[PDB]
């Protein structure tokens, strides 16, 4: 039976640990994939960690040079959340150097984008098999979320980017039924830049918090109705949740325009909470180190930095990276609303440590009704490996 | 359909071997987790070994210093009983450096407690996903059984400790429906100390045998009705089943007070048998070596040491450690009552052997209707490993 | 319920990536079988990669001399498509040094041929267990497709060869119900040579494109009704899709006779498309390097080389090998017709590289309704391995 | 639903290969258990390989001295037939240094016998959990088949031995319903010796061919009705199928008495075929080398050596060992009778080869309606391993 992500978000007070794979610590000996983009996404029955492999395993020579972001050996596979991205438990989902995956209550749709930088093709899988195909409309690295895509009453949505990554590019939405592309829409944000959205279903509409990789230290935002009418802009809160970013003291927030004079960025997430927001970000403001989630009073519809709640998930002395959003269906949490959860990717190796390789492990957290003590669930792996 | 742990315990005469993983012997080559607290617990369909990993694997450098009891890499995972705690068969249950897990006849509830020593949070998982959260009420190492928790007609119960470990602390019961905390109760035992209970369902009430880590060489005891009214005290039998302990010759038993002048302790178990008791303990009275189960005539309601039955499971020349209790549901044994089973953790490595590491394997036994020959199912691993 | 491969083929425009195992790249560290003949085949529920092992694993001494095509250690096993042929995920299907496998909508029939070159026996497995047996009728290496066999409304068909491999031999069809041989038929092609057919269900009839290993650089062809009446000949198109082959400039096509003066060959595939054909082949015309698929206008019923569509799957600078055909059932793609898919085997090691061993990995593709950018999904493994 | 092994045996003409694990060849690199007694046994749905591990893995130091037949680390586990006895696919069945296992159409009963030589206990598992316990009645190595046990219409039977192994001992039958011992019977064969029976269901009665380890080179035989009335004796055929044995030329057969003047023996099998027999045996008559199956005209009820059919499964230049019998249920083969299948254990290492270790792999065969070419499916492993 179809799965109804119609409900709003359970207003949540803190975040409690859900899972941790220790993949990289395990990889020293076990047979673990060198991975990246380890996102989470649930079905009426299970939560899964999706990932992108470099076609290799930790502590092997083939993990050499796994910094490179786009290879023909790259594949999207999945394991049950908390389980490390190891060979013998992984399902192959698709070939991909960029991806997204979700469940309509019946089957898993996954989208694997591969091919030459010039014309990349996006391969929709519904229930395992390729069911539809999306070519690069603009011939500059067709790409996608690197996090869960949303499915509201059987129909699934997601955001793709094409064009350069250091200036204006183009941004489309896509819609599908059982792996069938039955709808698309152009996102017009001139002077904007929308990368790797972190989406979730709220109040019937899928809300996204994304990455301005051009000039924004604040995050693109966009709300999507099932008819593809959208509002796109920026997270109103006057607290830059990107990296690199400026200081909280010196920054002006906008619901309409990119702020700061910083290029670059990194994937991130936010959760509306009526009027407030939960927003994640690295602790360091220049490096991908540490992690923490912030609750901003009226941060969702206004430019304030009122900080009701703050919580550290990883300390500033430890490597983080991507983070992303998903929800627990109703058929799982028992809640009467979609529990806001998220994950954090903790990258290790190149280009900051003595390794030929580059991989990440994760730490997932979930919205509960109470506040939770601050701590650090860091990767905890000892580098270099013998293959150095 | 819900599972009725209403029945009393099948009065049992001996204990026959149920499973043995040989994890540590296998770990020398295979990819096995460095583990500890390997408890067992059954559902209407399967029996599972739950465990706590150090986020590492045997014979790898990351297993270095796995004596430390509380790390952020620590996770509760599970395998089918008898199967070793290996990577590729393990389900992730929760992050935890202390835990308990059981099945209400419908789903698995697991409780993983993690976080900083000061304010640890306990994360209830029901059917995999975090469903409820329990903060440290007393800011001193919130912790739990390290063995199966009980579920009587759909509702599950268990015992947590908070406060120091070498003197007075606090002890609560908790109750849940489908991962929902719908009840708690304070256990008042001033001058007592209740650690890591080994519970089982008997006569409708969940009975526990626990660890006095303060002054008792005899074991705290407590019986719980579904309304949270409890009797708490000590195992009446005048035979100290803790470690370290004094001699059986010189010891006076109490149903009310801790006896002996010994600090420290170790997890252990007992089974009421009408009036008698089955109680386990290490053979050595000062060291965690060997193991044996004893039947005491009227040991449950009186201070006698009548020894009807005795049986050695592990010899005094071999390492043991924790032990713990569970039952076979009715939907499994076919019996007309809850078969009393138990397990024994056999620790190896630090601090007694030439290893950077510390792990354990197990040997599970079950209540049968006849007496069973004595023997030793010892870990059987050869240390040190190459990583020494 | 039985599975109806009655429909014709969805006329298709391009081919999009479906899966890629990276087995050989993974094998450097993980425990992967040394394999060959990695074909694909789907059931109403899953797509599987079938393979032939040398009874050994990559980077082990037992993979030494795994060039030899026929050993008693050879076994047909299977994994889910996209998953590498690794030990812990593989199901044993049958013992075999030549094979085929398919699903009647209810169970998997597999055919494993083993034994001495003189009298090899073919062991039909239906649903795992041996159900029927086919002896070598002509005492010269009884063999089969090395690709999917077809099942049209519950009955399954396939093509076997017996006799020499460098001149005239004999060619039979076989038919079965639930693993029962209930029909066979002799294929009379004097002056022809039919090896390793790549079959699929079209318009109710199973069409095959095969390998002339005698004199043909063009491919035998054969269409089979469920009553075993057949048309056999050659792919009309005047474009030689075999290897080695001559140039496209100098070649005359036939629907009746073998053309070219070349011995040898390699497995290959074609798809009728009404009147047109999709045909695969290596890029190199003398070596097993590269890969590409071609659409020929009226290539199916006439001798033309009109090239409507061409697409490179692997570049001429990289090793390929076998390729083969299968379809996505209706109970999977959702399409109203059988989606034409194929696979490519990419061989590595002996006799062209510095290895004691010989294995292959794969890259599968599927018929979509649009054209897809050209690229190379090459094996990507680094040889030699430490065992050199 | 219960499974009816009421039918007689399909009269069969030859034997075709069913599976082969290559465990030892795979073990050189993969994580395979050091094993022995690898028997096969089917349920209404799957065929499984059961085995006894030494609690260790090939090519590890713990496999050192795995000649010893009885250890406390010994465990009975299982995999799907054809699959090697590897860690990550194995289910733990029971602790055991001697065992048997079968399926009543509903669940798997397994019997694991462990303990001290003096009083060994046999632990009946039904559906995984220990359900019943059988003590050594005669205090001399309680033991069992080391092959499949039989289940005729829901009730399961098997043969145990106790007492010495080089002279008179005692032999009982046992009967169970859903793991419940509801029946036993004493087998009186004074001057006889019944070891490790190979049983199967025929004509409603379970027939056994066993091992005289005292004086017989011919095999004990016994037929069992569901009421425990039995005929016990020897295989009438005047062809000694044991090892060591005398020559076929010089030997007189008996249906009543042991013949030959040879001590020792090895597990073996026979199949009645109306009046004829299929009987297996090693080729060598003094060593456990090679293997072959023989059909003897009226061999079942008379002392003749008429040889209608003979077939070699393993050549005299290769190691064999145990062999044993099972059947394919009706719910699997589709046949109208129980297909006679068997397996062969091929031992390697100590005491004949340069290894600290001793293990075996297997090759299973099945009754088909035609004769099958002779060949050798030998273990094929290269010794010694690096750990020598
Ligand atoms: C900065 C451009 C960015 C997208 C905004 O490219 C991604 O950058 C990163 C990263 O760590 O910043 C990791 C991924 O592998 C890249 N993805 C692809 C499809 O190339
Ligand atoms: C002595 C205090 C004891 C609880 C009474 O702490 C446990 O001690 C042991 C042990 O082997 O004695 C092992 C566990 O890892 C510890 N658990 C935690 C949560 O730290
Ligand atoms: C050239 C003869 C050919 C069949 C036409 O034999 C196959 O040749 C090849 C190959 O790579 O060309 C690989 C297989 O292992 C062989 N199969 C068997 C059963 O021996
Ligand atoms: C010769 C006595 C024989 C039984 C007749 O003992 C078995 O002998 C062998 C063997 O290879 O001959 C292998 C087993 O491990 C032994 N089983 C036990 C329970 O010890
Ligand atoms: Ca930015
Ligand atoms: Ca104590
Ligand atoms: Ca040719
Ligand atoms: Ca004998």
The ranges assigned to domains in chain B are: 1-388
Half-sphere exposure of C318 (CA within 13 A, CB side): 22
Strand order through the sheet with B220-224: B195-202, B205-211, B220-224, B230-234
CA distances to A113, B14, B195, B232, B287 from B238, in Å: 71, 21, 20, 17, 20
Q: Which residue has the tokens 């975040």?
A: A15
| Dihedrals phi, psi of B61, to nearest 5 degrees | -70, -20
Is there a contact between D351 and D27 (Cβ–Cβ < 8 Å)? no
Residues 6+ apart with CB under 8 A from C337: C7, C8, C9, C10, C330
- Consecutive H or E run containing C23: helix C23-27
Q: Is C196 annotated as a binding residue?
A: yes
Q: What angle do CA B155, B161, B162 make, to 5 degrees?
A: 130
Residue D32 to residue D26: CA distance in whole angstroms = 7
- Residue B60 is among the residues annotated as catalytic for this protein: no
Residue B306 annotated as binding site:
no
From chain A, the residues in CB contact with C42 under 8 A are 129
The token duo for C211 is 């390998």
Residue C30 and residue C116: Cα distance in Å, rounded?
A: 33
* CA-based nearest residue to B294, from B8, B14, B10, B9: B14
- The SS3 of residue B17 is strand
Phi-psi region of A211 (alpha: psi -120 to 50; beta: other; left: phi over 0): beta
Distances (CA, A) of A209 to A1, A159, A346: 29, 11, 20
The residues, ordered by sequence, that sit 6+ positions from D227 with a Cβ below 8 Å of its Cβ are none
Q: Residue C308 burial (CB < 10 Å; 0-12/13-18/19+)? A: middle
Nearest Cα of chain A lies from the Cα of B127 at a distance, in angstroms, of 8
- Cα Dmax for chain A: 54
Residues 6+ apart with CB under 8 A from C294: C239, C241, C278, C279, C280, C281, C307, C309, C310, C311
Which H or E element spans position A332? Answer: helix A330-333
* Nearest residue (CA) to ligand 1, atom 11: A266
Q: What is the largest CA-CA distance in chain C?
A: 54
- Residue D335 CB–ligand 4 contact under 6 Å: no
Alpha-carbon span A38 to A30, nearest angstrom: 18
* Mutation probe of ligand 2 site: the residue of B39, B69, B122, B197 with most atoms within 8 A of C-beta: B69
DSSP letter for A61, please.
G
Nearest to C344 by CA among C312, C369, C371, C382: C312
Which of the listed CATH numbers 2.120.10.10, 3.90.1150.10, 2.40.70.10, 3.40.50.1860 matches domain D1-388? 2.120.10.10
Catalytic residue IDs of C: 69, 322
- Name the residue among C17, C86, C369 with its Cβ closest to that of A123: C17
Q: What is the DSSP letter of C9?
A: B
Q: What angle do CA A134, A138, A139 make, to 5 degrees?
A: 85
D306, D298 contact by CB (below 8 A): yes
Q: Which ligand is nearest to the CA of D164?
A: 4
D73 Cα: distance to centroid of ligand 8 (angstroms): 29
| Antiparallel, parallel or unpaired: β D220-224 and D205-211 | antiparallel
Burial of D321 (0-12, 13-18, 19+ CB in 10 A): buried
Tokens representing A382 are 């000892």
The rounded distance, in Å, linking the Cα atoms of B351 and C24 is 42
Q: Which residue has the tokens 């036939």?
A: C254
Q: Give the number of the ligand closest to the Cα of residue C347.
A: 3
Which of these, A179, A147, A76, A82, lies nearest to A326 by C-alpha position? A147
In total, chain D counts a number of residues equal to: 388
Among B51, B59, B62, the strongest candidate for a mutation testing the A interface, having the largest count of A CBs within 10 A, is: B62
Q: How far from C305 is each of C166, C242, C261, C295, C300, CA to CA, in Å?
A: 28, 15, 20, 9, 10
Q: Is C216 assigned to a binding site?
A: yes
Q: Are D164 and D192 in contact (CB under 8 A)?
A: no
Please report which helix (H) or strand (E) contains residue C122, including its range.
strand C121-126
Which tokens in the block code for residue B373? 């020959």
Q: How close is the Cα of A22 to the center of ligand 5, in Å?
A: 29
H or E segment and range at residue A344: strand A339-349
Please pick, among A60, A69, A203, A315, the residue that the annotation labels catalytic. A69
Q: Are B304 and B255 in contact (CB under 8 A)?
A: no
Query: Which of B271, B293, B295, B299 is closest to B281 using CA atoms?
Result: B293
């Amino acid at each position: 039976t179809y799965m109804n992500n119609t409900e709003a978000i359970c207003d949540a007070k803190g975040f409690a640990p859900f899972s941790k794979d220790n993949g990289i610590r395990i990889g020293s000996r076990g047979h673990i994939f060198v991975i990246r983009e380890p996102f989470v996404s649930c079905s009426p029955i299970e939560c899964r960690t999706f990932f992108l492999t470099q076609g290799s395993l930790l502590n092997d020579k083939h993990s050499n040079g796994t910094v490179k972001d786009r290879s023909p050996f790259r594949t999207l596979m999945s394991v049950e959340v908390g389980q490390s991205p190891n060979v013998y438990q992984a399902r192959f989902e698709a070939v991909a150097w960029s991806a997204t995956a979700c469940h309509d209550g019946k089957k898993w749709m996954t989208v694997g984008v591969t091919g030459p930088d010039s014309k990349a093709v996006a391969v929709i899988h519904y229930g395992g098999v390729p069911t539809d195909v999306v070519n690069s409309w603009a011939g500059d690295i067709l790409r996608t979320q690197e996090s869960s895509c949303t499915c509201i009453q059987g129909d699934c949505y997601w955001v793709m980017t094409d064009g350069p990554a250091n200036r204006q590019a183009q941004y489309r939405i896509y819609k599908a039924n059982q792996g069938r592309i039955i709808g698309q829409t152009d996102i017009s944000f001139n002077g904007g830049h929308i990368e790797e959205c972190s989406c979730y279903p709220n109040d019937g509409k899928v809300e996204c918090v994304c990455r301005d990789n051009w000039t924004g230290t604040n995050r693109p935002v966009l709300v999507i109705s099932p008819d593809l009418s959208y509002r796109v802009g920026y997270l109103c809160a006057g607290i830059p949740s990107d990296t690199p970013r400026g200081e909280d003291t010196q920054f002006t927030g906008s619901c309409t325009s990119p702020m700061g004079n910083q290029g670059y960025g990194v994937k991130g997430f936010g959760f509306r909470q009526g009027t407030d927001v939960w927003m994640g970000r690295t602790i360091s403001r220049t490096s991908r180190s540490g992690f923490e989630i912030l609750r901003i009073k009226n941060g969702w519809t206004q430019t304030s930095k009122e900080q009701i709640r703050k919580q550290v998930v990883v300390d500033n002395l430890n490597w983080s990276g991507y983070s992303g959003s998903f929800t627990l269906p109703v058929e799982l949490s028992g809640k009467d609303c979609l529990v806001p959860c998220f994950w954090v990717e903790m990258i290790r190796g190149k280009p900051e440590e003595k390794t030929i390789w580059t991989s990440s492990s994760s730490i997932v957290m979930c919205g509960v009704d109470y506040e939770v003590a601050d701590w650090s669930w860091h990767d905890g792996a000892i580098l270099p490996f013998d293959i150095d």
